[PDB]
Model the fold of this input.
Amino acid sequence: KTSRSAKAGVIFPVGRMLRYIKKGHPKYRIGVGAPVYMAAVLEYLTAEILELAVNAARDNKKGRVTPRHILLAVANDEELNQLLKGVTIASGGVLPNIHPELLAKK
Amino acid sequence: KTSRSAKAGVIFPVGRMLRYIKKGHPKYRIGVGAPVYMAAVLEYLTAEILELAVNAARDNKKGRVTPRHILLAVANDEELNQLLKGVTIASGGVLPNIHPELLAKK
Amino acid sequence: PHRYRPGTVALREIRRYQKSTELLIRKLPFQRLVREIAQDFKTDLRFQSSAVMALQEACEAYLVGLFEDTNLCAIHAKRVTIMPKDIQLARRIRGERA
Amino acid sequence: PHRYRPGTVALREIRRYQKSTELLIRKLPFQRLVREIAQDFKTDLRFQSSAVMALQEACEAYLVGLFEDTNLCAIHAKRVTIMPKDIQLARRIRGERA
Amino acid sequence: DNIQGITKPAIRRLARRGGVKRISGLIYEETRGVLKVFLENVIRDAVTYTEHAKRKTVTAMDVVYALKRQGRTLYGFGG
Amino acid sequence: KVLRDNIQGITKPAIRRLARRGGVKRISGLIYEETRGVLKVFLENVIRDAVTYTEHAKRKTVTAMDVVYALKRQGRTLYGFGG
Amino acid sequence: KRGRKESYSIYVYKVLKQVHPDTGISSKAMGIMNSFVNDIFERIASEASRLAHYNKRSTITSREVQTAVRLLLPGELAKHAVSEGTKAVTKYTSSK
Amino acid sequence: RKESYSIYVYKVLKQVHPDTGISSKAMGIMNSFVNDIFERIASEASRLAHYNKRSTITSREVQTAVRLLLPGELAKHAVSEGTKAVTKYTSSK
DNA sequence: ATCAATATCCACCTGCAGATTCTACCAAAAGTGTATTTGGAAACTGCTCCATCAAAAGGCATGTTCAGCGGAATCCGCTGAACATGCCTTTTGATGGAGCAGTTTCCAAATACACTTTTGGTAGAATCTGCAGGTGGATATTGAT
DNA sequence: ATCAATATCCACCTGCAGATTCTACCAAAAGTGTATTTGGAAACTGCTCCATCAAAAGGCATGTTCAGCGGATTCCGCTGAACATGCCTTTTGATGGAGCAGTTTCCAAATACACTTTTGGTAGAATCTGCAGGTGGATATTGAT
Done:
């Protein structure tokens, strides 16, 4: 057998997602493409954030990505930051940033 | 024939509600308790607002209830105000208010 | 010649508009503004007469609510004049910011 | 006797705490708080360890944000010291003021 | 230039209802920009709906929905 | 045991740390109490919804999903605790 | 053969007159009372189904509606709404 | 037994950079993310397939969803990706 | 400018907790074959949305005059920051026991079709009236002397 | 304080845009027997939550001293408010003309339903390495002299 994932060229589980769509919206029929399309968008997005989190990890001179890296990745990217309004990254931390008025002397 | 709404002791469409509860949340078996509860709750809420809106209408020397009254009614009741964060009552205006920092002087 | 001291009329204007509920933006101009913008998204588009009213209702409401918050910001900075930054701080805290 | 001027250590702290990610509230004192409150709602409850931690994650995040906005407000008033009326303006604009 | 069709007098009237007293002269353009972004966001999502529905006419319900997801709910146009 | 006045567990040192990550350099003295006020409200609300979900599931244990589900109601999504 | 647009109008009107026989409701006003009922209706059934889901239940019942309600309405408002609801389902049952 | 996206998140992780690993904690987060968005999309999908009185969630609904749900640039590259994968699937057999 | 006090940044080391591979059970996808069903397509009616034209009124753009506000500058009171002191309570880690969350097997009570008969609700028409809108005679408010 | 220019409030009248009442078709709720499903009940399991315990150091609390921030105050330059003015254009009301929705009726195309075969995940276990945490010292920032 050949996983639908392979057929469509994705890593994410196409079938597993047709199932998750059903267990969630029973009523509707799911075109054979929807779970496909879904898995493709989700792998895309996850790829995007991993690309940034990895770099973030590497600059930090770390061989393993952590939540703080994912934050900094998402925090510094305008659109991922937008996509994640009201999302709290546990153990994530905050973007360092001091307001100028707080720096002393003259 | 006898209407469930009649047996329920309500004005709101227990029957119709049920139909809606189904058309909207389609993969769920719906107990007859549900549409009845809904009818009763939404009727109360309706009654609730209408009460205050009317007070505002009369308060206004007017015999017909308008959006201006419903808003005044809503914006002045702490709980109705809370329940409707985000709601924008078309043509309801705002609630009369002027910071005292702007006030003339005296 | 009679002449009201500054702020008296404005203070009078506030009381007036917070009493009324009619739109305060010119209808025709607003419509041109909508269709124009809508165009840059999809060509040859029609608008239910009411869908435009809805847009204006929403727009006007949004702005009036924003000025309410902005005014809170001017007052906070010990001013009575709403300046651009007040609008910025306000949208910022709201999570809108751009 | 050496001694940093007022403000030098704070900026030290800020850089410090903005670079890290550990929780800033004592865990046990927080758990008691969570149970005290829950108890005052429904007696005889149990909490998954993770639940308490989920709650603490949520709480600390929440206040760190309220503090960021509170800080915009202080600075907006040409101040560097946050005050209650700062927290209050931020909360109000956020829609919380309930 | 349709935008500017949003006159200073109008903006000022809005702000009055908003309870404002004095108005920096820079406000007007500033208000025009903000409003532009708002209408853009809504109308963009409205249309998306209009199109996914395979329609040529943006109905009131499209706007109501656009509005909804922007977090801004609107009563009075669902009929 | 009897739990009483545990909001005082949110100590001044603590709140300062929270404020430092928040970027604050100076703190009025009336902040610490103001803050516990704000905190007890948010916490009571989250817990209140959470416990509601729990009572609905007919359980005697507040689970992580409960809290998560509760936080989403307040429009705050939490990552790193999902099932 | 043509549109039969359904609404809550008549009902809001009954509830209105039922206690204010000498107080009318404008058109626009009725339109808002409509958006309200629809709005809330949605939130409730929405949460209610959501509730069933968490508890791997295949039925949306009054139980979930009541919980949905507690989670959706403010303090005293929910208090009474629940009373009204449980009181309704009661009478509907203490009969047929 | 309980399922998650980890293996996949991990597969994808290895393609962006072969020499980088991920903490279980960070993996716990990539999971909240996938599950989160997976829901947002599907939920607009029906809320959409519904508004048009339809009884089927198709790639078309999923796509409109995505359009509404994502920021300009992400939205585009996402739509391509899906458009692409569905095309490919519609030829695998 | 110079130096004494401290905190910051960094290259090295290394045991171990926690991340990464490694193995076989088992829900679960991936094939097959009908059974049921959308939803685009062709066909067509009609609710409204648009395009043009033509007024008078209600605004709006403007430009002059200046009140008073925002913002700079100076000053000092006292409140928060820094800090060292004293020691409690939170943390850390291993231990036991059971309350209870999760799973499993099953009987009946509740809902779901498939479907027929009974009106409550909607639409367009007939009848009806609350409040806009104009007048005005009086009181209140604002602003100068 | 006392004018006096203006705005605002209140009493009263009435035609009519709009709310209300009304006369019937008909989609939909209510009624009925049968077929399909569900979730509470109950005995059972092992996972994880509560409570302990003893050690101890990280961290909280308390007091002292004073720097510098916040705010009060004075002052003036000048941006926004108020107002008369000339007048462009939004507003109001009609108006067929056809774009274009919502309706219906038919049917090939595409999930769904129920099984059976095949294997990509998952949990646990065996295996490995990034990095937490201490160690020392050189560097940079701070603050007084």
